[PDB]
Amino acid sequence: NLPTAQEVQGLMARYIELVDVGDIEAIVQMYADDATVEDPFGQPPIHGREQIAAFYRQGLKVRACLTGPVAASHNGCGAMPFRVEMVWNGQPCALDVIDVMRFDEHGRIQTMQAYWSEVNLSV
Protein backbone atom coordinates (compact mmCIF):
# COMPACT_ATOMS: atom_id res chain seq x y z
CA ASN A 1 0.00 0.00 0.00
CA LEU A 2 1.06 3.65 0.28
CA PRO A 3 3.96 3.26 2.70
CA THR A 4 3.56 4.24 6.29
CA ALA A 5 6.14 6.66 7.68
CA GLN A 6 7.88 3.56 9.08
CA GLU A 7 7.91 1.66 5.80
CA VAL A 8 9.26 4.61 3.90
CA GLN A 9 12.23 4.68 6.26
CA GLY A 10 12.88 0.99 5.69
CA LEU A 11 12.59 1.23 1.89
CA MET A 12 14.94 4.14 1.66
CA ALA A 13 17.48 2.49 3.94
CA ARG A 14 17.13 -0.55 1.73
CA TYR A 15 17.85 1.57 -1.35
CA ILE A 16 21.25 2.73 0.02
CA GLU A 17 21.93 -0.95 0.73
CA LEU A 18 21.33 -1.92 -2.88
CA VAL A 19 23.55 0.98 -4.17
CA ASP A 20 26.35 -0.05 -1.83
CA VAL A 21 26.47 -3.60 -3.22
CA GLY A 22 25.78 -2.37 -6.72
CA ASP A 23 22.90 -4.80 -7.36
CA ILE A 24 21.53 -2.79 -10.31
CA GLU A 25 18.69 -5.14 -11.08
CA ALA A 26 17.22 -4.97 -7.57
CA ILE A 27 17.44 -1.16 -7.63
CA VAL A 28 15.66 -0.80 -10.93
CA GLN A 29 13.02 -3.07 -9.57
CA MET A 30 12.42 -0.76 -6.63
CA TYR A 31 11.15 1.79 -9.12
CA ALA A 32 7.79 2.02 -10.82
CA ASP A 33 7.78 0.95 -14.46
CA ASP A 34 7.34 4.59 -15.41
CA ALA A 35 9.08 6.49 -12.57
CA THR A 36 11.25 9.53 -13.32
CA VAL A 37 14.60 10.40 -11.85
CA GLU A 38 16.05 13.91 -11.50
CA ASP A 39 19.72 13.60 -10.69
CA PRO A 40 21.11 16.02 -10.19
CA PHE A 41 17.98 18.03 -9.52
CA GLY A 42 17.84 20.73 -12.19
CA GLN A 43 18.57 18.49 -15.14
CA PRO A 44 15.90 16.95 -17.34
CA PRO A 45 14.32 13.80 -15.78
CA ILE A 46 14.83 10.27 -16.98
CA HIS A 47 11.64 8.28 -17.40
CA GLY A 48 11.11 4.54 -17.28
CA ARG A 49 12.85 1.44 -16.03
CA GLU A 50 14.75 1.16 -19.29
CA GLN A 51 16.35 4.58 -18.94
CA ILE A 52 16.85 4.32 -15.19
CA ALA A 53 18.52 0.94 -15.53
CA ALA A 54 20.87 2.62 -18.02
CA PHE A 55 21.37 5.52 -15.69
CA TYR A 56 22.39 3.15 -12.85
CA ARG A 57 24.61 0.84 -14.89
CA GLN A 58 26.62 3.90 -15.89
CA GLY A 59 27.28 5.01 -12.30
CA LEU A 60 28.32 1.83 -10.47
CA LYS A 61 33.12 0.71 -7.73
CA VAL A 62 31.15 2.71 -5.23
CA ARG A 63 29.93 2.52 -1.65
CA ALA A 64 27.14 4.64 -0.23
CA CYS A 65 26.19 5.17 3.38
CA LEU A 66 23.40 7.08 5.18
CA THR A 67 24.93 9.96 7.11
CA GLY A 68 21.76 10.75 9.01
CA PRO A 69 18.23 9.40 9.57
CA VAL A 70 15.63 9.08 6.89
CA ALA A 71 13.09 11.87 7.35
CA ALA A 72 9.69 10.51 6.45
CA SER A 73 6.21 11.90 6.15
CA HIS A 74 2.80 10.28 6.11
CA ASN A 75 2.01 10.96 2.48
CA GLY A 76 4.41 8.45 0.90
CA CYS A 77 7.31 10.86 0.82
CA GLY A 78 10.76 10.79 2.37
CA ALA A 79 14.14 12.43 2.16
CA MET A 80 17.55 11.28 3.27
CA PRO A 81 21.20 12.26 3.50
CA PHE A 82 24.00 10.04 2.26
CA ARG A 83 27.57 9.95 0.99
CA VAL A 84 28.90 8.37 -2.16
CA GLU A 85 32.54 7.50 -2.04
CA MET A 86 33.94 6.98 -5.55
CA VAL A 87 37.38 7.12 -7.15
CA TRP A 88 37.47 9.53 -10.05
CA ASN A 89 40.04 8.94 -12.79
CA GLY A 90 42.47 7.42 -10.33
CA GLN A 91 41.59 10.09 -7.81
CA PRO A 92 39.14 9.05 -5.09
CA CYS A 93 36.42 11.59 -4.31
CA ALA A 94 33.27 11.76 -2.22
CA LEU A 95 29.90 13.18 -2.98
CA ASP A 96 27.29 14.18 -0.40
CA VAL A 97 23.79 13.94 -1.77
CA ILE A 98 20.31 14.35 -0.45
CA ASP A 99 17.55 12.27 -2.07
CA VAL A 100 13.86 13.01 -1.90
CA MET A 101 11.61 10.13 -2.98
CA ARG A 102 7.95 9.62 -3.42
CA PHE A 103 6.43 6.17 -3.31
CA ASP A 104 3.19 4.96 -4.93
CA GLU A 105 0.34 2.76 -3.72
CA HIS A 106 2.48 -0.28 -4.35
CA GLY A 107 5.50 0.83 -2.39
CA ARG A 108 7.53 1.51 -5.49
CA ILE A 109 9.44 4.75 -6.14
CA GLN A 110 7.31 6.96 -8.32
CA THR A 111 9.78 9.80 -8.38
CA MET A 112 13.29 10.44 -7.14
CA GLN A 113 15.16 13.76 -6.98
CA ALA A 114 18.74 14.22 -5.93
CA TYR A 115 20.07 17.47 -4.57
CA TRP A 116 23.79 18.00 -5.07
CA SER A 117 26.27 20.07 -7.15
CA GLU A 118 30.05 20.60 -7.20
CA VAL A 119 29.74 22.26 -3.78
CA ASN A 120 29.09 18.85 -2.27
CA LEU A 121 32.01 17.14 -3.95
CA SER A 122 35.19 16.52 -1.98
CA VAL A 123 37.80 15.38 -4.43
Q: Which residues contact its own copies by CB under 8 A?
A: 5-6, 9, 40-42, 67-69, 71-75, 77-81, 96-98, 100, 115-120
Dmax (CA) of the chain = 44
Q: Which of 23, 31, 39, 104 is flagged as catalytic?
A: 39
**For its own copies, the closer CB: 29 or 75:** 75
- For residues 42 and 11, give the distance between their C-alpha atoms in angstroms, rounded to a whole number: 25
Residue count of the chain: 123
Smallest gap from Cβ 25 to its own copies, in A, equals 28
Tell me the chain's radius of gyration from C-alpha atoms: 14
Give the separation between CA 105 and CA 58, rounded to whole angstroms.
29
CB of 9 to its own copies, least distance (A): 6
| SS3 call for 10 | helix
Instruction: Cite the annotated binding site by residue number.
Output: 99
C-beta closer to its own copies: residue 40 or 107:
40
Known catalytic membership, residue 31 = no
Q: Active site includes 23? A: no
Task: Report, in Å, the least distance between residue 19 CB and its own copies.
Answer: 16
DSSP H helical ranges for 2-86? 5-21, 24-28, 49-59
- Name the binding residues for substrate: 99
